[PDB]
Amino acid sequence: MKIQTNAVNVLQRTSAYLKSGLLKETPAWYNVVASIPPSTKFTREPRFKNPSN
Amino acid sequence: QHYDESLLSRYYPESLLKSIKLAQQTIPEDTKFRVSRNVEFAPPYLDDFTKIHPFWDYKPGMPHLHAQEENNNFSIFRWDQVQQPLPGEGNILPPGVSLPNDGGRKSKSADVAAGLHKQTGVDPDYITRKLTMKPLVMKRVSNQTGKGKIASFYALVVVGDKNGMVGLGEGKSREEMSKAIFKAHWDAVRNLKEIPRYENRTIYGDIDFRYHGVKLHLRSAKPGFGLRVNHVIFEICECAGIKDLSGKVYKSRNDMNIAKGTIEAFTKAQKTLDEVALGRGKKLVDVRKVYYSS
Amino acid sequence: PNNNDEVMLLQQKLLYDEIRSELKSLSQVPEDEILPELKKSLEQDKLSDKEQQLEAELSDFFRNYALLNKLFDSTKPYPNLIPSANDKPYSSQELFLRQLNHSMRTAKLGATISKVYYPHKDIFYPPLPENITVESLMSAGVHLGQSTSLWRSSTQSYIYGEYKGIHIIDLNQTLSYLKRAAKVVEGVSESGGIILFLGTRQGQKRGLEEAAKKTHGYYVSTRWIPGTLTNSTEISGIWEKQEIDSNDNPTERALSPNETSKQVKPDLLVVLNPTENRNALLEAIKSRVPTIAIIDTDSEPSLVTYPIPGNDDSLRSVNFLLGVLARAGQRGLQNRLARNNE
Amino acid sequence: LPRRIVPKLATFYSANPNHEDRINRLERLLRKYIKLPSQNNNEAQQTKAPWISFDEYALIGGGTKLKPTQYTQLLYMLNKLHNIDPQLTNDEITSELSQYYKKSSMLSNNIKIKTLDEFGRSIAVGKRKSSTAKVFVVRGTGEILVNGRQLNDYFLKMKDRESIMYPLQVIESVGKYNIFATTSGGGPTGQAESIMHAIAKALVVFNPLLKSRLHKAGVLTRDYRHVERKK
Ligand SMILES: [Mg+2]
């Protein structure tokens, strides 16, 4: 499945609604999500050692 | 209970006092009244029956089965109005229903704004005042069924605030094209997105985007260049707030797919200078803007 | 020392049963046996000054509390137990209460139990996010991913290794992701947002209901109706809303029909089993609702705002992670109610 | 101080928030009182279970959303709480269960205990086809009169006579009662079986413990069959 973009950018899409005026009132989650950014790299990471042996 | 004439004479009219006196001399005070559970003679509410109600009682002077006047002594000589208007307020408007006094005064934008606010929480004022709607495709489609060909109206519209926010909406209706446009306008507001704009006038650089069979080649332009692009792209740029743009469409020129491709290109194929700078850890300077700076 | 107090009552209780039993005995006797003989005695008796005292004291005492009274108005535990006679053996109900007395005092004599896992305590005594260790996560089975044959390679960065034909989730990352997710729940709870807990796998209801209760949130355990968020007016408009103050107490103000039809969108969606709730996740995206979900090795991480890598098949692992998130919400709620007091 | 609008029920986002909230309230009671023993009279099949109808519960349990299986789940929990031993029950359980009892209890019953009259006679009426019978049963020695006439005179068919005797044969009291039967309408079979039905209904007053045996024999059931106009 394609790496989704719209689930981790809710804050940025919401900020466009608020700046334009399409959304009058800031949502309760808005400040919380801004202070705790989601991880959005979704990369494959190399590994250089077998932790068991 | 039997009451003295004095008390009864302060509440009931003189004409009815004789009847009350005779009833209090024929019905013993120790009468144990019983309730009838077969025939309901009295109304379901309390009433002394001393006043004639203008609606719930027969109209004085009107002919009817129980009229007590002689046939030559009726007092209804005008028949152009309803004799007994409804009681109380004068209406029976169901609770929660409004009298249709005014018709045809609705604004479809206000109808879209009210519905979307209730369904999604968007501000009605922004929709009805800040947004501009432009139909892009309006055609009739048809489905072949056993009964016969069923026609439908298809409408593709674009909405935008001319300040970065633009949306594309589609709508279908078997009844009329106006209903299809209403649905498309409704859909377009729900799909509103922000598009990056360089200096709020153009796009960042050039875009070569493929949307299905449509090849879109869009180039940024100098201030005052104007919109020199396919007519479908022109309308979208107008709503979105793009003023300067050049471009050419190759291969498929299907209006529907040009519009969707353009919206997709403006979002998925652009990168702001700020986003490029942060990703690469470099400073990007607009030479033309610095030349005119302090 | 004070047993007589109860003994005084029991004496009356026994006497009352005796009076009632022989009141029913006289209810069978024909009137012809008692009435005429009783009346004859009075015909052969003469009332005295004292006898007359009760002739009118009882008339009023019976014309005041029996006839001219209001029939209605406009030892508490087990108050319906019928005690058995002191000579008779215990009744079944008394034996049950006699066993309950033993269970409280004696049944737990001899030893205490330490370092033993009790399943219910995961729901009722969840730890705080700061006290969670890799050991605790591992004890709950959170590290046990899916079969390597079912691997969704987009989770590669969460995998610690493969063991016994399954992928082992990296608990060091699970802990960091769990702490971040917990802080989000606490923030939204402290801000007054609506938190919905969604889980539709068998057995999850108990955890879901308690999580909602201690965060003053909401839960769905049976089925997510497709369209709950995108088609909310056709599904949830009929249900009742209410206005509440900063202390979460109902204001009692009647709501205008305009306010009772408006969509009430969750501020945060927690999904226990995202692989079976694609509909809800996509609606959350469309509705710009941040979401938290447990991401197993076969689950797509990018579909949620804050993923928590972990086993989603075990009720212990799910309830352990849900409990931590629920307590984080509780602390946020308690911090919001505390700032209102002071 | 700041006020906000929130869903009333914790189950707001479920398919039927009203039913799930009620089920949760009952489930809490069944968890808080898990230990309380259940009635041992349940084996005795106590005849008490007046729960509201599916349609009545739909007023409070989601209306159209209410599903039959959801109503079945409500009854399984209402009965379980109701079947807790009466001595060991508490107010909380009864308070919750009160709201789910049929409101027919508002009124009273229409049945008054039947008793022998001033002359020791049990009077019952019976009907079969177009026939009717009013019998007077008193303690006696087996004397029977039909419309003032001897049984062999009024009823010529021995099978009709055997039908009249059957209820007395079930309780083995053929020689313990005198019967004065009065019958009108229909024919011999309708009248004989209408008398049979009326004797069975009159015998229950003398010993109400034998009603179950009379019902099992089939003599207390009113035969509904009548001549049907061809349709
Ligand atoms: Mg799994």
UniProtKB/Swiss-Prot annotation, chain A:
It is found in: Mitochondrion. Component of the mitochondrial ribosome (mitoribosome), a dedicated translation machinery responsible for the synthesis of mitochondrial genome-encoded proteins, including at least some of the essential transmembrane subunits of the mitochondrial respiratory chain. The mitoribosomes are attached to the mitochondrial inner membrane and translation products are cotranslationally integrated into the membrane. Component of the mitochondrial small ribosomal subunit (mt-SSU). Mature yeast 74S mitochondrial ribosomes consist of a small (37S) and a large (54S) subunit. The 37S small subunit contains a 15S ribosomal RNA (15S mt-rRNA) and 34 different proteins. The 54S large subunit contains a 21S rRNA (21S mt-rRNA) and 46 different proteins. Belongs to the mitochondrion-specific ribosomal protein mS23 family. Present with 1920 molecules/cell in log phase SD medium. This is Small ribosomal subunit protein mS23. It comes from Saccharomyces cerevisiae (strain ATCC 204508 / S288c) (Baker's yeast). The chain holds residues 1 to 53 of 264 of the full protein.
Swiss-Prot record, chain B:
Signal peptide: none annotated. GO terms for molecular function: RNA binding; structural constituent of ribosome. Pfam families: Ribosomal_S5, Ribosomal_S5_C. It comes from the Eukaryota. SUPFAM superfamilies: dsRNA-binding domain-like (SSF54768), Ribosomal protein S5 domain 2-like (SSF54211). Present with 6680 molecules/cell in log phase SD medium. This is Small ribosomal subunit protein uS5m. It comes from Saccharomyces cerevisiae (strain ATCC 204508 / S288c).
Swiss-Prot record, chain C:
Keywords: Mitochondrion, Ribonucleoprotein, Ribosomal protein, Transit peptide. The keyword Ribonucleoprotein applies. It is found in: Mitochondrion. Transmembrane segments: none annotated. One of its GO terms (molecular function) is structural constituent of ribosome. One of its GO terms (cellular component) is mitochondrion. It holds the Pfam family Ribosomal_S2. It comes from the Eukaryota. One of its GO terms (biological process) is mitochondrial translation. The keyword Transit peptide applies. Component of the mitochondrial small ribosomal subunit (mt-SSU). Mature yeast 74S mitochondrial ribosomes consist of a small (37S) and a large (54S) subunit. The 37S small subunit contains a 15S ribosomal RNA (15S mt-rRNA) and 34 different proteins. The 54S large subunit contains a 21S rRNA (21S mt-rRNA) and 46 different proteins. Component of the mitochondrial ribosome (mitoribosome), a dedicated translation machinery responsible for the synthesis of mitochondrial genome-encoded proteins, including at least some of the essential transmembrane subunits of the mitochondrial respiratory chain. The mitoribosomes are attached to the mitochondrial inner membrane and translation products are cotranslationally integrated into the membrane. NCBIfam families: rpsB_bact. Belongs to the universal ribosomal protein uS2 family. Present with 6890 molecules/cell in log phase SD medium. PANTHER family: 30S RIBOSOMAL PROTEIN S2 PROKARYOTIC AND ORGANELLAR, SMALL RIBOSOMAL SUBUNIT PROTEIN US2M. This is Small ribosomal subunit protein uS2m. It comes from Saccharomyces cerevisiae (strain ATCC 204508 / S288c). The gene is MRP4.
UniProtKB/Swiss-Prot annotation, chain D:
It comes from the Eukaryota. GO terms for cellular component: mitochondrial inner membrane; mitochondrial small ribosomal subunit; mitochondrion. This is Small ribosomal subunit protein uS9m. Component of the mitochondrial small ribosomal subunit (mt-SSU). Mature yeast 74S mitochondrial ribosomes consist of a small (37S) and a large (54S) subunit. The 37S small subunit contains a 15S ribosomal RNA (15S mt-rRNA) and 34 different proteins. The 54S large subunit contains a 21S rRNA (21S mt-rRNA) and 46 different proteins. Belongs to the universal ribosomal protein uS9 family. Its main location: mitochondrion. Transmembrane segments: none annotated. One of its GO terms (molecular function) is RNA binding. The chain holds residues 33 to 263 of 278 of the full protein. GO terms for biological process: mitochondrial translation. The gene is MRPS9. It is found in: Mitochondrion. It comes from Saccharomyces cerevisiae (strain ATCC 204508 / S288c). Keywords: Mitochondrion, Ribonucleoprotein, Ribosomal protein, Transit peptide. Component of the mitochondrial ribosome (mitoribosome), a dedicated translation machinery responsible for the synthesis of mitochondrial genome-encoded proteins, including at least some of the essential transmembrane subunits of the mitochondrial respiratory chain. The mitoribosomes are attached to the mitochondrial inner membrane and translation products are cotranslationally integrated into the membrane. The keyword Transport does not apply.
